[PDB]
Design an enzyme around this catalytic site. Structure first.
Site, PDB file in Angstrom:
ATOM      1  N   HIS A 101       0.816  -1.207   0.000  1.00 55.83           N
ATOM      2  CA  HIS A 101       0.000   0.000   0.000  1.00 55.83           C
ATOM      3  C   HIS A 101       0.860   1.272   0.000  1.00 55.83           C
ATOM      4  CE1 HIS A 101       0.204   0.124   4.653  1.00 55.83           C
ATOM      5  NE2 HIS A 101       0.292   1.386   4.304  1.00 55.83           N
ATOM      6  N   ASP A 115       0.137  -7.700   1.834  1.00 56.65           N
ATOM      7  CA  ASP A 115       0.607  -6.325   1.849  1.00 56.65           C
ATOM      8  C   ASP A 115       2.116  -6.287   2.007  1.00 56.65           C
ATOM      9  OD1 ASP A 115       0.540  -3.499   1.889  1.00 56.65           O
ATOM     10  OD2 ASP A 115      -0.435  -3.296   3.785  1.00 56.65           O
ATOM     11  N   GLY A 134       2.423   6.577   8.525  1.00 56.30           N
ATOM     12  CA  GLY A 134       3.846   6.895   8.288  1.00 56.30           C
ATOM     13  C   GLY A 134       4.808   5.822   8.833  1.00 56.30           C
ATOM     14  N   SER A 165       3.831   2.627   8.309  1.00 55.30           N
ATOM     15  CA  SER A 165       3.533   1.663   7.239  1.00 55.30           C
ATOM     16  C   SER A 165       4.752   1.141   6.524  1.00 55.30           C
ATOM     17  CB  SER A 165       2.654   2.319   6.176  1.00 55.30           C
ATOM     18  OG  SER A 165       1.310   2.561   6.596  1.00 55.30           O
ATOM     19  N   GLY A 166       4.852  -0.151   6.269  1.00 54.98           N
ATOM     20  CA  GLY A 166       5.977  -0.647   5.510  1.00 54.98           C
ATOM     21  C   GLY A 166       7.172  -1.021   6.360  1.00 54.98           C
TER      22      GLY A 166
HETATM   23  C1  0QH Z   1      -3.637   2.795   4.073  1.00 50.98           C
HETATM   24  C2  0QH Z   1      -4.106   1.532   4.800  1.00 50.98           C
HETATM   25  C3  0QH Z   1      -4.019   0.315   3.905  1.00 50.98           C
HETATM   26  C4  0QH Z   1      -3.267   1.225   6.016  1.00 50.98           C
HETATM   27  C5  0QH Z   1      -2.978   2.351   6.982  1.00 50.98           C
HETATM   28  N1  0QH Z   1      -1.662   2.108   7.515  1.00 50.98           N
HETATM   29  C6  0QH Z   1      -1.171   2.721   8.610  1.00 50.98           C
HETATM   30  O1  0QH Z   1      -1.580   3.844   8.930  1.00 50.98           O
HETATM   31  C7  0QH Z   1      -0.082   1.977   9.469  1.00 50.98           C
HETATM   32  F1  0QH Z   1      -0.518   1.719  10.679  1.00 50.98           F
HETATM   33  F2  0QH Z   1       0.345   0.822   8.992  1.00 50.98           F
HETATM   34  F3  0QH Z   1       1.023   2.655   9.650  1.00 50.98           F
HETATM   35  C8  0QH Z   1      -4.064   2.489   8.039  1.00 50.98           C
HETATM   36  O2  0QH Z   1      -4.222   1.707   8.967  1.00 50.98           O
HETATM   37  N2  0QH Z   1      -4.693   3.648   7.759  1.00 50.98           N
HETATM   38  N3  0QH Z   1      -5.752   4.310   8.700  1.00 50.98           N
HETATM   39  C9  0QH Z   1      -6.239   5.312   7.679  1.00 50.98           C
HETATM   40  C10 0QH Z   1      -6.875   3.450   9.181  1.00 50.98           C
HETATM   41  C11 0QH Z   1      -7.620   2.598   8.166  1.00 50.98           C
HETATM   42  O3  0QH Z   1      -8.309   3.038   7.232  1.00 50.98           O
HETATM   43  N4  0QH Z   1      -7.294   1.351   8.540  1.00 50.98           N
HETATM   44  C12 0QH Z   1      -7.899   0.270   8.041  1.00 50.98           C
HETATM   45  C13 0QH Z   1      -8.202  -0.751   8.937  1.00 50.98           C
HETATM   46  C14 0QH Z   1      -8.803  -1.929   8.500  1.00 50.98           C
HETATM   47  C15 0QH Z   1      -9.133  -2.107   7.151  1.00 50.98           C
HETATM   48  C16 0QH Z   1      -9.799  -3.429   6.706  1.00 50.98           C
HETATM   49  C17 0QH Z   1     -10.922  -3.657   7.671  1.00 50.98           C
HETATM   50  C18 0QH Z   1     -10.395  -3.391   5.289  1.00 50.98           C
HETATM   51  C19 0QH Z   1      -8.832  -1.067   6.239  1.00 50.98           C
HETATM   52  C20 0QH Z   1      -8.217   0.117   6.681  1.00 50.98           C
HETATM   53  C21 0QH Z   1      -4.955   4.930   9.817  1.00 50.98           C
HETATM   54  C22 0QH Z   1      -5.702   5.719  10.897  1.00 50.98           C
HETATM   55  C23 0QH Z   1      -5.532   5.366  12.234  1.00 50.98           C
HETATM   56  C24 0QH Z   1      -6.151   6.123  13.210  1.00 50.98           C
HETATM   57  C25 0QH Z   1      -6.947   7.229  12.900  1.00 50.98           C
HETATM   58  C26 0QH Z   1      -7.132   7.590  11.572  1.00 50.98           C
HETATM   59  C27 0QH Z   1      -6.509   6.834  10.575  1.00 50.98           C
END
Ligand code: 0QH
Ligand code: CA
Length: 240
Positions: free
Chosen positions: A45, A93, A186, A188-189
């Site tokens: 991602h 991923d 941030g 991530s990865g």
């Molecule tokens: C871009 C995605 C693929 C992964 C993204 N990665 C990260 O932020 C990580 F933690 F790895 F550093 C994530 O969790 N993004 N969020 C955007 C959450 C999100 O959308 N996570 C998520 C969780 C589960 C699923 C499954 C259920 C389909 C999809 C997305 C972070 C977040 C956390 C707290 C408050 C606001 C935002």
């Protein structure tokens, strides 16, 4: 990393910063792990958008010269064949980046140790998450590398209905979930470093956290389980 502490300079020397060109400058978007002098492992991602990417090894403060950094271009991106952007909960991923040139190894730049294929850690194993990601939910990036102690949560607990349920697969590792400490955007990865037989090995590639918040009780940070991908990783490096 939420709830982290600052890491020492040469504490995690396989950690890299994956950056994209943003106008005139370069911005950090993801972590990764140096696995060969010219190959980096990161999350798929992180490279979904078609941007200009570079890798920085030997990095500690994002905003200051440390006198240890090497900056190299990404020449080829190999994402896992089964990765689907619309379903991160399906797994796969992971992505491998071939660098435009070989980096020089020294006390700041070292290869990450991979686990043997199939290795599953016991519940509550000692692992550290590292990265420059947000230090609070909806906060800002860290300037210096952070680390947090993030013990594992095994699959039977992590996929129970009070934790992530069905969303976590056995191709993933869960760590944390205490409501204080977690990965965050941030990070991530990047690596989850776990102590096995006196050696830190990279057992996870950071993948996702709760959309409700980064440090949420019973929603541990979720990682791609690196030991489920050892044959794919070695088949890409040997054929590219
Ligand atoms: C871009 C995605 C693929 C992964 C993204 N990665 C990260 O932020 C990580 F933690 F790895 F550093 C994530 O969790 N993004 N969020 C955007 C959450 C999100 O959308 N996570 C998520 C969780 C589960 C699923 C499954 C259920 C389909 C999809 C997305 C972070 C977040 C956390 C707290 C408050 C606001 C935002
Ligand atoms: Ca720096």
């Amino acid at each position: 990393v939420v709830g982290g502490t600052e890491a020492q300079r040469n504490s995690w020397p396989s950690q890299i910063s994956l950056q994209y060109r943003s106008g005139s400058s370069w911005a950090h978007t993801c972590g990764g792990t140096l696995i060969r002098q010219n190959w980096v492992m990161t999350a798929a991602h992180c490279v979904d958008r078609e941007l200009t990417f570079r890798v920085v090894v030997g990095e500690h403060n994002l905003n200051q010269n440390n006198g240890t950094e090497q900056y190299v271009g990404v020449q080829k991106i190999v994402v896992h064949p089964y990765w689907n952007t619309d379903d991160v909960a399906a797994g796969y991923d992971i992505a491998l980046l071939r660098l435009a040139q070989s980096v020089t190894l020294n006390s700041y730049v070292q290869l990450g140790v991979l686990p043997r294929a199939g290795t599953i850690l016991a519940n509550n194993s000692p692992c550290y998450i590292t990265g420059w990601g947000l230090t609070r939910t909806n906060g800002q990036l860290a300037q210096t590398l952070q680390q947090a102690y993030l013990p594992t949560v095994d699959y039977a607990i992590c996929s129970s209905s009070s934790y992530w349920g069905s969303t976590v697969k056995n191709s993933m590792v869960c760590a944390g979930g205490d409501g204080v400490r977690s990965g965050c955007q941030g990070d991530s990865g990047g690596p989850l470093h776990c102590l096995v037989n006196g050696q830190y090995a990279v057992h996870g590639v950071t993948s996702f956290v709760s959309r409700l918040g980064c440090n949420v009780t019973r929603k541990p940070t979720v990682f791609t389980r690196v030991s489920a991908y050892i044959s794919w990783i070695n088949n890409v490096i040997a054929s590219n």
